[PDB]
Structure 1
Amino acid sequence: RKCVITGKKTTAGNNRSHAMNASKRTWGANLQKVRILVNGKPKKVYVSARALKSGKVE
Structure 2
Amino acid sequence: AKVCYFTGRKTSSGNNRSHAMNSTKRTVKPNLQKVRVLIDGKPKKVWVSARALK
What is the TM-score when the length of structure 1 is the normalising length?
Answer: 0.84
- Shift in Å at residue 37 of structure 1? 1.0
1:39 aligns with 2:40: yes
Q: Can you give the 5+ residue segments of structure 1 that lack an aligned partner in the other structure?
A: 54-58
Listed as ranges, the gaps of 5+ residues in structure 2 are none
Superimposed CA distance per residue, residues 15-36 of structure 1 (whole angstroms, 9 cap, x where no aligned partner): 1000000000011100000111
Letter in 1 for 2:44: K
Runs of 4+ residues over 3 Å off in structure 1: none
Q: CA RMSD in A?
A: 0.9
Higher strand content, 1 or 2: 2
Q: What is the number of equivalent residue pairs in this alignment?
A: 53
Q: Which amino acid aligns with 1:44?
A: K
TM-score, L = length of structure 2: 0.90
Aligned-pair CA distance for 1:41 = 2.8
